[PDB]
Amino acid sequence: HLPLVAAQPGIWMAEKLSELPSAWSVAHYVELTGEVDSPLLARAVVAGLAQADTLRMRFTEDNGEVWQWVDDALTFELPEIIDLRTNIDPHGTAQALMQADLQQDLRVDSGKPLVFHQLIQVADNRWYWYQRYHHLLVDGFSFPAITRQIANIYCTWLRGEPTPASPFTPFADVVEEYQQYRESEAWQRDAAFWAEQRRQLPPPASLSPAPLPGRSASADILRLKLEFTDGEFRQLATQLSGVQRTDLALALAALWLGRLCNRMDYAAGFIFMRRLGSAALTATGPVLNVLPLGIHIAAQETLPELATRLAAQLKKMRRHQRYDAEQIVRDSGRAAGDEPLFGPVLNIKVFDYQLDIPDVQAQTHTLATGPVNDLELALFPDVHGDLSIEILANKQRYDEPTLIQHAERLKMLIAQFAADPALLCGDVDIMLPGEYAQLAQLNATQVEIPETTLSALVAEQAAKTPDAPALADARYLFSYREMREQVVALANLLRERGVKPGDSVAVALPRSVFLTLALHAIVEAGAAWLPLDTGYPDDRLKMMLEDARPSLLITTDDQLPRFSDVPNLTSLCYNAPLTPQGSAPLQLSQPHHTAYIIFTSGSTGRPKGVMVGQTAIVNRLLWMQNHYPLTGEDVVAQKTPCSFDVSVWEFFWPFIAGAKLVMAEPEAHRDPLAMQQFFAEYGVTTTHFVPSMLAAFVASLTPQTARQSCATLKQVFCSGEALPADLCREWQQLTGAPLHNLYGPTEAAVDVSWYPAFGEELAQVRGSSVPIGYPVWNTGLRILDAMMHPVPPGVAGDLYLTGIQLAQGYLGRPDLTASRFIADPFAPGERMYRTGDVARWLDNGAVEYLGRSDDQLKIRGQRIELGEIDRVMQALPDVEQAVTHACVINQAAATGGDARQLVGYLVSQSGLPLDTSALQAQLRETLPPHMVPVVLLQLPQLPLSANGKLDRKALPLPELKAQAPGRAPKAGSETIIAAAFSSLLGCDVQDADADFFALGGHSLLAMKLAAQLSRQVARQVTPGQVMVASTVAKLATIIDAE
């Protein structure tokens, strides 16, 4: 007969998507104490339930439409009394009988009845009266009213008086109220208001770092209840007495949640009961609206200013409360399980209701309030000045003990405002005593080290072990003495061509023993080396050389025709040993010199060079040799490309300990089969992987091949991406070789924190990723909120780094240096590096990585600034706008590791169609290859959220079906290869010009392809050949070559 109204349409969609038996059935019991006429109260329950028209409501699926009608024909249960008294000993057997009622399938569709009562005690001078309703029939405001009426009927009968009349308005009058309201000018006014609220609304925020669930949250929750006995709230309200008590508790709760969210602007929910003023006041159905409230903490405001602007908005919201929140959702693009508009939910309405049966005490006890997806906070400031609260919390996102600590923080804020009502919102602190002390000991990493040099340490160790093998590759082997002879000769040669202390020397060499010699010789001259990836395009190397102004480029003879264009550069070809002339040190390098300059992607469109002090890298390497000692039975794998800071400890750490360093062949760092042959062939004990590569390498193994190639490993390090716990566990199962997690941006000296990723320590990680852990020597980790206060354990903050390991700064960019190397407010005169990483302290002191606060990404461990690509794309002709976006194009390629690929979105200035294939060709002239987007898509306009910012979630993925098919694949290699693409990409490939990377392949997936093709033909095909020949037709011609 009638449509679902008010809270029902929201409650309906919410259960359709729920995946639990009774997430939407409210239930509770009342604890009656004394003599009770149970058969009469049974009778009273029946008469009471008849007076609530909404309890006989029946529903039907009207081909999508949903309709309700009250069955005046339905007759009610008499409740069953249960004699469980002098039976089983516990009265928790009754609590089991109640808890068991809610494990049934009580959803509408189950066809079970939606209301249930029964009487239990069974007369132990006490009684448990149990009640459950589906939340489509009842608010938290009407079921205590229904109970009171059953108790009124009961009490009346005892007096010998006729059954009381119903106090209940028909719920139908409510339907008319909204059916008349939805067809009214106030609907158009209310829609317009909430649409402005959406444009201005801050994003959701939660104390849990995990993303907010839009569906299927548990109706079993934590239900904390806390009373504040300190009376500092009493002294607070009376010391202001302009705020309206409730307003004060709200503003405190807003400061408290903002501090736990690490947000100064966030969206929370607020509960309007919608009873007064409505025909619903006396109806029994659910009329209840949780509405979005935009919280804006202002650091410069006082606490009553916060209360005032909040109440102003709550007043304004109250005027428009009739607009169902559910309607706001579909007004926004979001629909059906999409991310919520707010996280926490604030509330003032009561926690219990009373019953006055004569000579009988009654106590309600709540069992199911309904699901809470995140966290909900009820505030009760009494007229007598005490304060109490009730926290409801998702059982998957929180636990009781930490919630108690946070609430004690809420007592601390109250105590702090009690002592200073003029206290600003920004000067308040939620650090418990002894928490700040505990973070002190964690940063107490002071280890006194003498002033020294790489060149010093290397020379000192070659004096100890002249004849121990030091440096080898396929073609050469050098003792520590023979090594120092070649270092000192090249360093003398470098001075003959002008390299002086303080200079830069750029290095563009293939991987051999001579790469290492070149670096040791440069530091020996007192210069700093600058590594060039010759895989970068010509135009980009010109930038780095023009910016760093190196005195000298060391290269090979066939590479310098690329550099004939650079003006005023001097080159040296180095690819064979020099006549020795002793091994004495030159003693030219000094602790304040720069040791090296590694460039990194920079937001402005132009890479920036990070300059690292000689002392900062000495600290890093002496610390490693204390924490993971090497002994010269060790063999270290030079596997990492020289343009990534990780290579530095590979180039230098073995030689300060006496161990051997062995060079891998070129391109072997990206071919997991080649690494297996490498490690076994040289008996490697020590090496490094990026987590994405560890994954590809694990995937290349079985236990037997693991025992054959990794048998010699003793120490493996991992860094540059979040290290997932389960990956470490697969590694432990294959090799038993200890594995360690290291963290650090280039702007400190390679790594500032460590953590064990094996053994007992790994067996304790309950999280998805391994902690980044603990500071190295002379290094501190600061985790600070947006106001640069320190954050307590468990709360997300911005990570800052301190100590001697900090970089000298950005090459030639004193503004960017000032931006990121900021003054440490906790150590005046000292700097502190702003990482851009978000992180939190775990309860054992270790730090957990959580994400970035900016547009920097680690695609497969390699650092990219989406801004760099954006600005380069916008410089292309007829490109007005350009947005780079990282995404997983093809879920079948997410075998493991980071599977993201870069996608450019372009809007043309002219509005004409753009030659995206030519534009992407052009980008390969400017950008390093891993920074060219694999797909460029042109859009008529960029998709925008309600606030006007970019809506990446609306950005269309690339189609796996090209609209312009090419030649079908020819018999032979092309047919094979097509098939292999299909095997790994998960779609049929019948196009010879299909692009492995455009179809969602990535370099880790290329490593699996190369192995598979190398089986399906006798000949080898390298993963590097899949990079170059991106397509079927190109990849075929490479293996058909005769």
Ligand SMILES: *P(=O)(O)OCC(C)(C)[C@@H](O)C(=O)NCCC(=O)NCCS[C@@H](CS(=O)(=O)NC[C@H]1O[C@@H](n2cnc3c(N)ncnc32)[C@H](O)[C@@H]1O)[C@@H](N)CO
């Ligand atoms: P395909 O051709 O697309 O890929 C093929 C392969 C995998 C072979 C290719 O991707 C490859 O050769 N990759 C090697 C990547 C690599 O070695 N990268 C440099 C190491 S990271 C560097 C610091 S950094 O500034 O570049 N970025 C630091 C930054 O990264 C995050 N981070 C580092 N360590 C972390 C841990 N342990 N957990 C969580 N996050 C971590 C942070 O965001 C940090 O600011 C080195 N200092 C790192 O050791």
